[PDB]
Write a protein that binds this ligand. Structure first.
Ligand SMILES: *[C@@H]1O[C@H](CO[C@@H]2O[C@@H](C)[C@@H](O)[C@@H](O)[C@@H]2O)[C@@H](O[C@@H]2O[C@H](CO)[C@@H](O)[C@H](O)[C@H]2NC(C)=O)[C@H](O)[C@H]1NC(C)=O
Ligand SMILES: *[C@@H]1O[C@H](CO)[C@@H](O[C@@H]2O[C@H](CO)[C@@H](O)[C@H](O)[C@H]2NC(C)=O)[C@H](O)[C@H]1NC(C)=O
Ligand SMILES: *[C@@H]1O[C@H](CO)[C@@H](O[C@@H]2O[C@H](CO)[C@@H](O)[C@H](O)[C@H]2NC(C)=O)[C@H](O)[C@H]1NC(C)=O
Ligand SMILES: *[C@@H]1O[C@H](CO)[C@@H](O)[C@H](O)[C@H]1NC(C)=O
Ligand SMILES: *[C@@H]1O[C@H](CO)[C@@H](O)[C@H](O)[C@H]1NC(C)=O
Ligand SMILES: [Zn+2]
Ligand SMILES: [Zn+2]
Length: 423
């Protein structure tokens, strides 16, 4: 037979996920530690170095080290997802629309300059707007500016919806049959006073339903990406990450389409968390991966924070089932002491937890293990939750119940049931 595609001589696809870069262009080592970074809001940086400080957002040197690590890692990857939050945590009057656009431009061009051939799928974060959190339900300067910045990666239809509402879907050029849906979940975030009481802000739910329907009929698989996740904040009691009304509506769509959705990937929490979306009777439907931040920032009172992280997913080519996740990190104290970075493997999920893959069943069974008393699996998970920032951090019985309940129960009814039974 002539002119047949050439067969291979077990291939695995891979993609990167980076999030919550939070560049602080003010960062510099100075004798007066209240002047190291505007993101410390006048507190003395604790022990600052070239790669940052726990009381500061990311120096450019830290962000560049993360992307240089990716570039030089020897990992092949066919795309990258980037789930938002580029400007630093400074007060509203210290920023502006133009300043926000300048920072997002810097990060976008850093990526485009270092990875000219790599398609990247961004999502907007709640800090990717001026004033922060107030992302609107109609077009805006920011939405237009990111549409221009991200045009190398996005087709006409995606640019159109991004300009209008901050969301889009896009085919993955290197992966026929895979579509990325990039939601603007900041429309559902509590502090957003521009969307209070709207049943379908920016018509994103209607759009999402229609997009998933078309993916079904076009035999596509979907990865969902967004900044703010669904479900419950695992360190708090009964505090959904987005407003309850919206969390419930979004989860209803995700459950119904859970056979088309092969992955969900979020940021915002600056922590390494898992969730398993199940139906009301506890049949696992969809795996959810919240990635930790590059920035190590924390407030003055907060007891723990994260080390900087970036992560890589492995998936089945042409099928898009998730096979593994490799979490990398920077030991910030180690890097700052010597002045050179050593981005390094934190863990491989299948090896760390002795699971076969990232399918909902495999993670659902793992979390049953977490729940057993003195589970070594949960102890490891809690260490990884802060990206190995503090091995002596402990999670008492109340803390663990809040964590496990949030991992397994993404809707209000299931979550409440879990707390009533175990708290
Ligand atoms: C769900 O999608 C089907 C399929 O529609 C087509 O296939 C998609 C992959 C995409 O290419 C769409 O643009 C296509 O229209 C919808 O069924 C079609 O609906 C149109 C009217 O809008 C009708 O003229 C066609 O005959 C329908 N085709 C079939 C096979 O039924 C369907 O309406 C969508 N459902 C919902 C609830 O949105
Ligand atoms: C993004 O911003 C950084 C600095 O905020 C720019 O970097 C300057 O030059 C080198 C590398 O180009 C940095 O290490 C320095 O920190 C920066 N200079 C000064 C005086 O601080 C970088 O060029 C910007 N990138 C883009 C694409 O705009
Ligand atoms: C990151 O690097 C720091 C500094 O090297 C490590 O700090 C060690 O912390 C343990 C307690 O957790 C101490 O007993 C050691 O003496 C410290 N080592 C040094 C050389 O100071 C820290 O453990 C590292 N983080 C990880 C996850 O390995
Ligand atoms: C910062 O640290 C120095 C100690 O070297 C101290 O004199 C100064 O008052 C501190 N400022 C604040 C706000 O903690
Ligand atoms: C809007 O407010 C009313 C009453 O305050 C409430 O019944 C309704 O569910 C709210 N809608 C949304 C989308 O929050
Ligand atoms: Zn953030
Ligand atoms: Zn955020």
């Amino acid at each position: 037979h002539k002119l047949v595609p050439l067969a291979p001589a077990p291939a695995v696809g891979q993609f990167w996920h980076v999030t919550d870069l939070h560049l602080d262009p003010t960062y510099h080592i100075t004798d007066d530690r209240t002047k190291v970074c505007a993101s410390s809001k006048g507190a003395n940086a604790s022990n600052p170095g070239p790669f940052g400080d726990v009381l500061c957002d990311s120096p450019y040197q830290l962000i560049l080290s993360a992307f240089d690590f990716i570039k030089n890692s020897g990992q092949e990857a066919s795309f990258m997802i980037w789930t938002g939050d580029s400007p630093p945590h400074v007060p509203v009057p210290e920023l502006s629309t133009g300043t926000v656009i300048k920072v997002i431009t810097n990060m976008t061009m850093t990526v485009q300059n270092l990875f000219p051939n790599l398609q990247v799928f961004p999502a907007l974060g709640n800090h990717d707007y001026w004033p922060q959190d107030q992302l609107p339900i109609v077009t805006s300067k920011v939405y237009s500016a990111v549409a221009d910045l991200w045009k190398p990666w996005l087709g006409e239809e995606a640019i159109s919806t991004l300009k209008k509402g901050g969301f889009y879907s896009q085919k993955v050029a290197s992966n026929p049959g895979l579509r990325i849906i990039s939601l603007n979940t900041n429309l559902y975030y509590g502090p957003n006073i521009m969307t209070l009481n709207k049943t379908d802000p920016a018509n994103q739910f209607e759009w999402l339903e229609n997009t998933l329907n078309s993916s079904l009929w076009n035999k596509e698989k979907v990865y969902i990406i967004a900044h703010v996740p669904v479900g419950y904040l695992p360190y708090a009691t009964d505090t959904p990450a987005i407003r309850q009304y919206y969390n419930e509506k979004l989860l209803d769509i995700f459950r119904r389409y859970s056979s088309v959705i092969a992955g969900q990937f979020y940021g915002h929490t600056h922590r390494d968390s898992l969730m398993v979306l199940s139906d009301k009777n506890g049949n696992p439907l969809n795996s959810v991966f919240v990635a930790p931040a590059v920035t190590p920032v924390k407030g003055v009172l907060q007891k723990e924070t994260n080390n900087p992280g970036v992560r890589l997913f492995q998936y089945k080519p042409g099928d898009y089932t998730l096979l593994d996740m490799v979490q990398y990190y920077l030991n910030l104290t180690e890097a700052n002491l010597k002045g050179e970075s050593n981005w390094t493997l934190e863990y491989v999920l299948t090896q760390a937890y002795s699971v076969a893959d990232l399918q909902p069943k495999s993670l659902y069974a793992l979390v049953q293990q977490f729940a057993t008393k003195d589970s070594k699996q949960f102890l490891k998970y809690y260490h990884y939750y802060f990206v190995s920032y503090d091995s002596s951090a402990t999670c008492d019985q109340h803390c663990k119940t809040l964590q496990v309940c949030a991992i397994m129960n993404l809707d209000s009814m299931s979550y409440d049931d879990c707390l009533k039974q175990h708290l």
